[PDB]
């Protein structure tokens, strides 16, 4: 059992697992082609975990160190960087553990942007 | 009804929004009934992008990068209960070339 859970205040909460989905833009990362058209283009990489919700997470990886200019060439005077976001996930507790689920956070790459060293 | 979920949040500062060629503002969204209670929604500053010279260029566009996230919402006043909820958020912006 995650011993860290002892240090969480409060230890447990009551939650309705009937998920209320307010997002009408389904598959928001994979439904657009921004990953291809961006000056800081990226590939999405799939991760699958049966003991996690969401079970499938796609994460961005920048294709280039620099950014792509109007000529279609990489310019190293700027940087392709991944935009990171901390998100909530649920995880399944091991069988010998008290309850079935636990709540925690992970850091994921959502997409990439082009940044200049100094503004 | 509900289910006992263990908290394991406690476990074992970027300036991209300014330095980006598709810069964005961060709008503070506060909700006492939501966890996270505060979310910063990205808002693209320009229709175009900033070029190498530091000027607005309309040959490209600033567009939001969005994703669906898991969120806790406080249920009606039985109280001390929550409900799982999915929302769409903008985390930043990127610069893309027009579909042509």
């Amino acid at each position: 059992c995650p011993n860290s859970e002892d240090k969480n205040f409060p230890r447990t909460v009551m939650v309705n697992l009937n998920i209320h989905n307010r997002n009408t833009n389904t598959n928001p990362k994979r439904s657009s082609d921004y990953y291809n058209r961006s000056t800081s283009p990226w590939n999405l990489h799939r991760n699958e975990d049966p003991e996690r919700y969401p079970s499938v997470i796609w994460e961005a990886q920048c294709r280039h160190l620099g950014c792509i200019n109007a000529d279609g060439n990489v310019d190293y005077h700027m940087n392709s960087v991944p935009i990171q976001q901390e998100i909530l996930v649920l995880r399944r507790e091991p069988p010998h553990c008290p309850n079935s689920f636990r709540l925690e956070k992970i850091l994921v790459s959502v997409g990439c942007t082009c940044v200049t060293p100094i503004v | 009804r509900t289910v006992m979920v263990n908290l394991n949040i406690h476990n074992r500062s970027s300036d991209y929004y300014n330095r980006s060629t598709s810069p964005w503002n961060l709008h503070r969204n506060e909700d006492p009934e939501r966890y996270p209670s505060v979310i910063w929604e990205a808002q693209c500053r320009h229709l175009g992008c900033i070029n190498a010279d530091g000027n607005v260029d309309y040959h490209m566009n600033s567009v939001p990068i969005q994703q669906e996230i898991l969120v806790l919402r406080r249920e009606p006043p039985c109280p001390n209960s929550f409900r799982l909820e999915k929302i769409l958020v903008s985390v930043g912006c990127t610069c893309v070339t027009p579909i042509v």
Epitope: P10, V13 | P32, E33
Partner: antibody
């Protein structure tokens, strides 16, 4: 210019009742959560209650639960604190404040509980 | 429980630091308030690091580990006041304050 002005303070007997009001101006009142914070003379800040912009959601400190009722009238830009069954320990300066960050405060109003 | 030093002293023009500690404070957002005698509290730092418009740039904040810290650079006599840390606890549905810190400017 954002402002919060409170009314209704004064002398009240133990067990008695008293309503505080907080008038908000210079912003869209219904777009913000509001709170009451109190401070006994020479003491620190103590959170009393919070009301969401969303109807139905109120929050209270344990020492106050069941005795104080927070409410708001958005049409009048006014926050209320209904204080019943008042005790000597409730004697304090009461502040209203906006948002969970408490980013703007009222001028405060003294409530004195005494027989 | 949010814990603050009862008081800190600082030489004029130097850097003052006021700490605020509690459980999972690094998991939450800390806010800082300045209260001068007879006055209402004033927000000087919110969401750990953010500074409201009108507040001098010499005021900064951080939240590392179970400790939030209010920092005042080039401290002036006018900065003498009580300083309170505050934080919203979502799961408790409460706002918690530290006990407060009295800042004294020396000399």
């Amino acid at each position: 210019q954002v402002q919060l002005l409170e009314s209704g303070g004064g002398l009240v007997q133990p067990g008695g009742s008293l309503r505080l009001s907080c008038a908000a101006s210079g912003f869209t009142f219904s777009s913000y959560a509001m709170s009451w914070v109190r401070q006994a003379p020479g003491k620190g800040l103590e959170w009393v209650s919070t009301i969401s912009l969303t109807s139905g959601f109120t929050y209270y400190a344990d020492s106050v639960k069941g005795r104080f009722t927070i409410s708001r009238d958005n049409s009048k830009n006014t926050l209320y604190l209904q204080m019943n069954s008042l005790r000597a320990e409730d004697t304090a300066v009461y502040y209203c404040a906006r948002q969970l960050t408490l980013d703007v405060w009222g001028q405060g109003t003294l409530v004195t509980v005494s027989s | 429980v949010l814990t603050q030093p009862p008081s800190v002293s600082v030489a004029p023009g130097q850097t003052a630091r006021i700490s605020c500690s509690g459980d999972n404070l690094g998991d939450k957002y800390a806010n800082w308030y300045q209260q001068k005698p007879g006055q209402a509290p004033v927000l000087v730092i919110y969401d750990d690091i953010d500074r409201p418009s009108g507040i001098p740039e010499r005021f900064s904040g951080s939240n590392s580990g179970n400790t939030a810290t209010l920092t005042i650079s080039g401290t002036q006599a006018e900065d003498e006041a009580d300083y309170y840390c505050g934080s919203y606890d979502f799961f408790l549905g409460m706002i918690v304050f530290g006990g407060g810190t009295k800042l004294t400017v020396l000399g």
